[PDB]
From a paper:
Particularly, the GDP (guanosine-5'-diphosphate) -bound inactive Rab7A is reported to be recruited to autophagosomes by its GEF (guanine nucleotide exchange factor) protein, the MON1/CCZ1/C18orf8 complex, which can specifically convert Rab7A to its GTP (guanosine-5'-triphosphate)-bound active state. However, due to the lack of complex structures, how the mammalian MON1 (monensin sensitivity 1)/CCZ1 (calcium caffeine zinc sensitivity 1)/C18orf8 (chromosome 18 open reading frame 8) complex specifically recognizes the GDP-bound inactive Rab7A and achieves its specific GEF activity for Rab7A remains unclear.
In the complex structure, both MON1A and CCZ1 are assembled in a triangular manner by three LD (Longin) domains, and directly interact with the C-terminal α-solenoid domain of C18orf8 forming the MON1A/CCZ1/C18orf8 complex. Further structural analyses of the binding interface of Rab7A (1–181) T22N with the MON1A/CCZ1/C18orf8 complex revealed that the specific association of Rab7A with the two LD1 domains of MON1A and CCZ1 is mainly mediated by both hydrophobic and hydrophilic interactions. In parallel, the positively charged K31 and R69 from Rab7A couple with the negatively charged E238 from MON1A LD1 and E41 from CCZ1 LD1 to form two pairs of salt bridges, respectively.
Numbering used by the authors:
A (entry chain B): 17 to 482
B (entry chain A): 236 to 652
C (entry chain C): 1 to 657
D (entry chain D): 8 to 185
Write the structure that this text describes.
């Protein structure tokens, strides 16, 4: 038996104004992955997506198409900037089953994908590109279609190698910032330290403060912090924490001369402060791309577990003297603070005794501070987490989420699957809470009671219904 | 004529909620539901290309989704059907609605006669073969939007007296002619009794097409008009024949005698009176008329506070019951809105991959429960101020009122010729 | 040098009296701090001037010989005069009354009175070269009943009134010290101790004069100061002043040392718990603090001078006398004159001019001569009257001219809140022991006095942070940093954060359009819950939209603000949600049929509103008794929606039992 | 109604060549002259109203395989070739070939075509009109018309003969299929 999971069939970006006249149709395509496809096939897929948009603009001239479904692919569109359409073509699952005549046959499981997961992934692609490389039209006014195409290729040709659509789920519909639980005292200490640092480093312009890969503080705005958080916890922290799991024989840790009086150690830019000609290659992000359009060097300094993200303005080039001074200043302070928060978190974990695994496996998301919590997803690998419950229940949660959004009010949907698994979901006060209860032989009232009990244990200070 | 009128028209032609078009595999408009058949070629020219575009590269267009309104494509050998809904209906349900429209076009003229007239010339205009008979296919959507038998795929039997049903069904059972297959006695979209040829089986899609046939035109009320009809789900090959005695000139109680040959008008039309006479002399005709005086039973009879409507279907037999939808859902719009909710629960509890057996939805409007088990599918609809305890209590109270009053509101014994 | 250069000033209203001339003998009583000027010549006309005394005590006595010493008892009731070598006279002093001198001679015949000490209002000690004799005065009887005594060889004596201790130098080298205390008219023995001597030359034997010892009351404790001059050698570390701690119980222990880095003559004083030393050779004054962190060599604590040596502020004596009509300039008294004599505490007398001064410490000038705000605060948290100057520092620490680094502000606030926390703990313990049933006559239950150092949030809100925030000169990031720094110090010393501080943080966070900062401070519970804060957030609904929701859940976390939640939900038109909420707590029987469906036609699904009227009696009809509402809540008037009515509802079956 | 497919050639205002006759921007782009343009008009032909549904087929070899389907049930195929170009005349006997192989109507030898020579206003004509006329005569009398899509002359009569001959053909279709 074979269960072919979904997989990125294609991805492209076009603009239906470029090459307005025939003989110039190839000028519509600004990017196409994979690039080895016959040119006529490129223009056929682009023509089909543009035709579908032009079609569903006959019935609602303001709301163009958002996804097209077929037998072997679902194609999700997106218009992030005026007339710059992106399209992602995913492949439906396949059940390949051996027949008794000796010929195994393929059945395209047409109705197994969720529109929301992959539309979110597509908008996430655009927003990550926006963070790391500007916008689409600013790049145009800067350097023409040639520069636009070059930037698009150089970013996406590498980015799309880390879209693992085989494991996309609800937590991608969410796209949230898993916060760290802290009390008044430690959080105010963190504010004191951040103000100290930013004032003793007068060129530092913005700041973020992560702990254990879970955000704590964020100087940036809200729309520009979720992308940067996804980048920090997907592509920055795992690669630079892996050497501590791969051992002394790593080709990067060997060139990492640490400091003895403080555990401070960089993660971007000059990673080894002793080589006197170390280069200051800091990643360079774009924030507030709507109003002020700032370009900032990103300096991730990581103590034991905590991690400050300083954002220096564009022109102010940090010299290696600046990096040595910054380490000398921040290392001891950040080591003290990281030890403080680690001790506090350990003591708070011990204070909550080892009660049996909470029989409600939930998922929580807060549409305003983008907090997000889950005990159905286990961190098997820190880059992307893998769930801990049946895939059937995950698709059930997907269907529930898809049934919610139709009106933005206080709703709740309880369900019992034929495995007798109870699945609850509430949407209220701009929050969504999905719960799974493996309670066999239950009834609706006991299940409502159980959701009440979990809500009182964890979200008591979080508005909800009884 | 200035373009101002055309502008006002097409600006108000797109807010309609259930645009349905059906066209031929060439690109010639067969049927257009809310628009003129002339303009909505050019548009709907697009509609065949998009299908024949994705058909080139070993694929098929299956649906388009904006945010707010789906657009569903369905293909059958001689016709493609496209439905631009604006509702909360998953792609599958709209596909079922289009398949009903297609099985309807199959009922107007046989389905082995479409393959033939389109394998002979793909140029064949089909809007001048099934011309005039649009309101047979234009109301079927309205029945699809108000009557809940479609979403449930079962016939709603009339709540007749326990014994009177046996008498009327016996009067039916006696008049068995050789050129007969089914004898159906329906009363205004409800199934009083039915007697099929022995060891035969009817399909609810066919019953609903006959319901639409009768409820569509008014001619059926004057006298016995002997008409042909093919029931596509039973035998797609050839025609059947049936005629329509609206028994009492004031009320509406038609019996159906579907037959196997075309010129048996008299051999089976005798069965009309050979049936009516014994029933009328039994006096059971008076009890039938009296039950017909009020065929809809409200929900207050159940004696349940916080309960606005319900549907109940018995998997054992295959029929269902439902009160009159009356209290807030009276406006012909709220009727579809409520109807769409049971559509949601029925699709959500019958997803062959992931099946459920208890739902509950506590919204900013009617909040509903949907129980399902081996024997029966029970769907309800409350008032939003209903605690879960109150709903789980009403779901046993109503079930008791059903199991107690069952034999009155159902058809318990299948009658065979 | 301007006024911003000196810190030791003199009294604005000094005591001017008749100067010292061979006819008018002048003496001083440190116990009562009264100067006697007696014009002899038979009719000894004595005038008495004190610091508090409004009208100088003027009177006449007879010249019964040369007057040697004169002192009044406590409350100034009894006068005692030593005029002879063995016999001291006394007078029950009633003003405007003739008093008979009664004479008492010492018990030991060959004992010579050095003087006397009015230990209390009715008891007195006589120090003779051969011992001490403690009597009590019987003025109406005009006799002295000898209470106690002790015969001992003596070089000289010294008396401290506030601690009421006599000290006697007995050994010929005067380096052995016999102290004696007095309490409740009872004499008590204090243990003897010894003074180490510095290196002496072979030209004489160094005699420890009366002028080398002093007694002081520093931080409530009794200290013995000895002025030890380092004889001139190549290793001359300058002269010093050693503070032997003399406890009321236990051995007198050398505890503190004071380095002068000078050689010559010195005049000591104690002003506002500081030890002031004047070097007369170069007219310099140095202040020592004993509670400032000093060099602890493991045995004793050494202290540098707190500030750089300066001269006492040049003083301007106000003109007095009948010649004051002419425009004469003020006379500046001769600072550091050789006629300046010192008495503990803080009393300097000038016979050359006949003036009396109580040296004082100004605190504004130390805002400049000491920049280390850490030590500066360690210094201003001990002196009295330190609230105006501490607030001036705290507000100057934030002006753009002298804007201080942030750890400096953190340390300053930590010290202020340490004082505040001490006061709060003392007050809580007092109130708890008061409710615990302990009486006021208990020596442990005294209400803790709130000193001038304690700066509660009211002060740091009125004098520091309000103007600082409203000045709009500082970079707003600095302003919010200072605010959250104050709040951090507070929450660290486990103090309650007054809600108005949170209102200030919100005012500032919104005024500079920092909104996600407000969201984070709300999410992590830095701006704690309240009804007024919820009102403020809800008011902010226009600028930053989620604030509305940020308010709502706040109200929910209150659990004491139900009706507020209900009115805000009615405002947001979530009628169904308000209803499903009030039915949750339990008030669904007490609610009014009016509001929920009189605010009905504003959402127009009237069964979205009339589900409820019958429901309104589906709960409690048994209490009243009617299908439609009666005037129970004036609802009998409020039947006005059944006009366009759809369907058949029309009444509740009024269940009555 | 008449499903008329208008074979053209890319290069001559393929995106503005047909828009004179239908007099309205119904057809814009929906896989249109990148796929095939869809545009209609009512004609009064022998006092009968005919509904011409017009599919301009893009000649791009990248967009050609959609020709097998777009040619189903054709009532008239109209060939547009340039009088100023000899190459699209040489191709005129290869125009009909692919159309007859893919559309494959029942009776191809008499299936109605119409040849249209556009851009007559432009000077320096390379194809003598008589050349195309002789092609038509040797091709079983396919009606031909010279027209100017920038002048809108005589194209109405081209659609006129389209609709008349194809009305004969459609009466024949209904007669055979019954």
């Amino acid at each position: 038996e074979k269960q072919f999971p979904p997989a990125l069939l294609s991805f492209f970006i076009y603009n239906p104004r470029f090459g307005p006249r025939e003989g110039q149709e190839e000028n519509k395509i600004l990017f196409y992955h994979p690039n080895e496809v016959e040119k006529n096939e490129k223009i056929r897929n682009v023509g089909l997506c543009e035709a579908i948009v032009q079609f569903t603009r006959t019935f609602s001239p303001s709301k163009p198409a958002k996804s097209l479904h077929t037998q072997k692919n679902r194609q999700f569109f997106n218009e992030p900037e005026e007339n710059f359409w992106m399209v992602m073509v995913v492949r439906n699952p396949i059940i390949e089953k051996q027949s008794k005549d000796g010929k195994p046959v393929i059945e395209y499981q047409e109705e197994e994908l969720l529109d929301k997961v992959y539309s979110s992934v597509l908008r996430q692609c655009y927003s990550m590109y926006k963070l790391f490389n500007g916008t689409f039209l600013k790049a145009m006014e800067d350097g023409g279609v040639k520069l636009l195409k070059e930037r698009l290729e150089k970013f996406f040709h590498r980015y799309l190698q880390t879209l693992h659509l085989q494991s996309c789920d609800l937590l991608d519909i969410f796209g949230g910032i898993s916060f760290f639980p802290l009390d008044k005292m430690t959080y105010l200490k963190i504010q004191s330290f951040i103000n100290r640092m930013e004032e003793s480093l007068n060129i530092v312009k913005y700041t973020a403060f992560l702990y254990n890969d879970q955000l704590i503080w964020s100087g940036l705005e809200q729309d520009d912090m979720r992308i940067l958080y996804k980048y920090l916890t997907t592509s920055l922290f795992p690669r630079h924490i892996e050497p501590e799991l791969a051992g002394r024989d790593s080709p990067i840790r060997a060139e990492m001369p640490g400091n003895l009086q403080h555990y401070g150690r960089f993660l971007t830019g000059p990673l080894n402060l002793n080589d006197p000609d170390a280069k200051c290659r800091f990643p360079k992000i774009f924030v507030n791309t709507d109003d002020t359009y700032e370009e900032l060097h990103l300096i991730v300094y990581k103590a034991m577990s905590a991690a400050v993200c300083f954002m220096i303005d564009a022109s102010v080039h940090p010299t290696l003297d600046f990096c040595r001074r910054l380490d000398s200043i921040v290392g001891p302070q950040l080591t003290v603070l990281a030890s403080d928060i680690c001790e506090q978190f350990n003591i708070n974990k011990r204070m909550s005794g080892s009660e049996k695994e909470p029989q409600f496996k939930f998922i929580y998301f807060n549409h305003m501070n983008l907090a997000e919590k889950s005990t159905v997803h286990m961190r098997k690998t820190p880059s992307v987490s893998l769930t801990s419950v049946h895939p059937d229940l995950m698709k059930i949660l997907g269907d529930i989420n898809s049934d919610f959004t139709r009106v933005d009010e206080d709703e709740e949907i309880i369900v019992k699957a034929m495995s007798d698994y109870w699945v609850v979901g509430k949407k209220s006060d701009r929050r969504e809470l999905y719960v799974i209860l493996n309670q066999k032989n239950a009834n609706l009232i006991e299940v409502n009671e159980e959701v009440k009990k979990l809500c009182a244990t964890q979200f008591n200070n979080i508005f909800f219904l009884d | 004529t200035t373009e101002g009128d055309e502008e006002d028209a097409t600006e108000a032609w797109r807010l309609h909620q259930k645009h349905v078009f059906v066209l031929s595999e060439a690109g010639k408009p067969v049927y257009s539901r809310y628009g003129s058949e002339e303009a909505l070629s050019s548009t709907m020219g697009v509609m065949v290309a998009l299908v024949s575009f994705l058909e080139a590269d070993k694929n098929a267009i299956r649906s388009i989704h904006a945010d707010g309104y789906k657009v569903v494509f369905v293909r059958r050998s001689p016709l493609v059907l496209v439905a631009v809904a604006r509702t909360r209906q998953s792609a599958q349900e709209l596909a079922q609605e289009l398949l009903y429209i297609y099985y309807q076009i199959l009922s107007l003229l046989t389905g082995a006669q479409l393959s033939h007239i389109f394998q002979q010339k793909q140029n064949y205009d089909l809007r001048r073969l099934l011309s005039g008979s649009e309101r047979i296919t234009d109301n079927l959507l309205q029945l699809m939007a108000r009557d809940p038998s479609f979403l449930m795929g079962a016939a709603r039997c009339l709540p007749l007296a326990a014994a009177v049903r046996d008498t009327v069904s016996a009067s039916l059972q006696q008049a068995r002619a050789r050129s007969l297959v089914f004898s159906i006695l329906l009363a205004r979209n409800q199934l009083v009794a039915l007697v099929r040829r022995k060891d035969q089986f009817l399909h609810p899609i066919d019953l609903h097409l006959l319901f639409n046939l009768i409820s569509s035109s008014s001619s059926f009320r004057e006298g016995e008009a002997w008409t042909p009809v093919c029931l596509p789900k039973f035998n797609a090959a050839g025609f059947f024949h049936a005629h329509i005695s609206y028994l009492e000139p004031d009320t509406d109680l038609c019996l159906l005698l579907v037959s196997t040959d075309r010129e048996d008008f008299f051999a089976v039309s005798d069965c009309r009176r050979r049936f009516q006479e014994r029933l009328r002399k039994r006096g059971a005709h008076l009890a039938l008329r009296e039950a017909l005086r009020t065929p809809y039973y409200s929900v207050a009879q159940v004696g349940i506070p916080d309960l606005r409507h319900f549907l109940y279907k018995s998997k054992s037999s295959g029929l269902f019951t439902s009160p009159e939808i009356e209290a807030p859902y009276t406006s012909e719009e709220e009727q579809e809105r409520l109807l769409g909710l049971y559509q949601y629960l029925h699709s959500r509890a019958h997803n062959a991959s992931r099946p459920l057996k208890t739902i509950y939805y506590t919204g900013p409007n009617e909040n509903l429960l949907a129980w399902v088990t081996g024997a029966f599918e029970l769907y309800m609809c409350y008032s939003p101020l209903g605690t879960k305890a109150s709903a789980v209590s009403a779901i046993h109270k109503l079930m008791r009122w059903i199991r107690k009053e069952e034999d009155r509101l159902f058809i318990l014994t299948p009658l065979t010729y | 040098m301007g006024e911003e250069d000196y810190y030791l000033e003199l009294c604005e209203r000094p005591v001017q009296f008749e100067k010292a001339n061979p006819v008018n003998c002048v003496f001083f009583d440190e116990a009562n701090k009264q100067v006697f000027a007696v014009r002899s010549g038979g009719a000894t006309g004595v005038v008495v001037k004190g610091p508090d005394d409004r009208n100088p005590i003027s009177f006449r006595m007879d010249d019964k010989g040369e007057v040697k010493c004169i002192k009044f008892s406590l409350e100034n009731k009894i006068l005692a005069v030593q005029r002879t070598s063995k016999t001291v006279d006394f007078c029950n002093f009633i003003p405007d009354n003739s008093q008979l001198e009664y004479t008492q001679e010492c018990k030991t015949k060959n004992a010579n009175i050095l003087g006397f000490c009015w230990t209390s209002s009715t008891e007195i000690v006589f120090i003779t070269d051969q011992g001490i004799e403690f009597y009590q005065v019987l003025p109406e009887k005009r006799s002295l009943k000898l209470l106690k005594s002790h015969n001992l060889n003596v070089n000289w004596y010294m008396y401290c009134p506030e601690s009421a201790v006599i000290l006697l130098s007995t050994t010929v080298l005067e380096n052995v010290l016999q102290p004696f205390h007095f309490r409740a008219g009872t004499m008590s023995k204090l243990p003897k101790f010894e003074i180490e001597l510095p290196a002496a030359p072979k030209s004489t034997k160094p005699s420890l004069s009366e002028r080398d010892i002093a007694m002081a009351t520093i931080y409530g404790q009794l200290y013995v100061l000895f002025l030890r001059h380092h004889s001139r050698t190549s290793n001359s570390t300058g002269a010093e002043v050693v503070l032997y701690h003399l406890p009321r119980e236990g051995a007198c222990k050398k505890m503190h040392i004071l380095k002068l880095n000078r050689t010559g003559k010195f005049a000591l004083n104690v002003v506002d718990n500081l030890v002031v030393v004047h070097h007369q050779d170069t007219e310099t004054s140095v202040i020592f603090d004993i509670k400032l962190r000093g060099e602890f060599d493991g045995s004793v604590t050494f202290h540098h001078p707190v500030l750089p040596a300066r001269s006492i502020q040049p003083y301007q004596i106000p003109i007095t006398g009948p010649a004051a009509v002419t425009s004469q300039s003020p006379v500046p008294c001769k600072l550091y004159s050789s006629s300046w004599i010192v008495f503990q505490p803080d009393i300097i007398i000038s016979a050359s001019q006949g003036y009396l001064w109580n040296l004082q410490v100004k605190l504004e000038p130390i805002v400049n001569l000491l920049p280390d705000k850490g030590r500066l605060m360690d210094f201003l948290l001990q002196r009295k009257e330190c609230k105006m100057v501490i607030l001036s520092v705290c507000s100057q620490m934030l002006s753009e001219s002298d804007r201080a680094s942030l750890p400096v502000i953190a340390t300053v606030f930590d010290k202020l809140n340490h004082e505040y926390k001490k006061y709060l703990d003392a007050e809580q313990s007092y109130a708890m022991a008061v409710e615990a049933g302990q009486s006021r006559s208990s020596p442990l239950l005294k209400r803790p006095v709130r000193t001038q150092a304690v700066l509660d949030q009211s002060d740091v809100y009125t004098h520091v942070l309000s103007a600082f925030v409203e000045k709009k000169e500082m970079p707003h990031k600095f302003v919010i940093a200072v605010l959250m720094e104050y709040i951090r110090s507070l929450n660290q010393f486990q103090i309650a954060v007054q809600h108005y501080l949170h209102e200030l943080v919100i005012k500032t966070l919104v005024q500079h359009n920092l909104f996600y900062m407000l969201h984070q401070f709300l999410q992590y519970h830095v701006l704690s819950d309240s009804k007024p804060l919820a009102c403020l957030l809800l008011s902010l609904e226009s600028f930053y939209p989620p604030a509305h929701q940020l308010s709502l859940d706040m109200l929910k976390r209150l659990s004491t603000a139900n009706d507020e939640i209900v009115e805000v939900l009615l405002s947001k038109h979530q009628v169904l949600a308000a209803l499903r909420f009030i039915r949750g707590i339990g008030g669904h029987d007490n609610i009014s049929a009016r509001k929920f469906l009189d605010a009905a036609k504003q959402t127009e699904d009237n069964m979205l509103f009339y589900t409820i009227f019958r429901f309104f009696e589906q709960r409690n009809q048994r209490l009243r008794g009617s299908p439609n509402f009666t005037p129970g809540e004036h609802c009998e008037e409020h039947v006005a929606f059944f006009k366009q009515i759809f369907g058949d509802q029309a009444l509740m079956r009024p269940t009555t039992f | 109604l008449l499903k008329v497919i208008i074979l053209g050639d890319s290069g001559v205002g393929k995106n503005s060549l047909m828009n004179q006759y239908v007099n309205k921007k119904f057809s814009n782009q929906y896989k249109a002259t990148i796929g095939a343009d869809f545009l209609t008009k009512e004609v009064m032909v022998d006092d009968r109203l005919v509904t011409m549904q017009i599919w301009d087929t893009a000649g791009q070899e990248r967009f050609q395989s959609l020709g097998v389907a777009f040619y189903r049930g054709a009532d008239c195929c109209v060939l547009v070739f340039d009088v100023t170009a000899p190459n699209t005349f040489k191709t005129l006997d290869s125009w009909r070939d692919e159309f007859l192989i893919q559309a494959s109507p029942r009776d191809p030898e008499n299936f109605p075509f119409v040849v249209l020579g556009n851009k007559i206003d432009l000077e320096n004509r390379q194809v003598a009109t008589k050349r195309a006329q002789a092609w038509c005569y040797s091709k079983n009398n396919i009606p031909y018309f010279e027209t100017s899509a920038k002048e809108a002359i005589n194209v109405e009569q081209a659609f006129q003969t389209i609709a008349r001959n194809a009305l004969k053909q459609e009466t024949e279709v209904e007669l055979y299929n019954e």
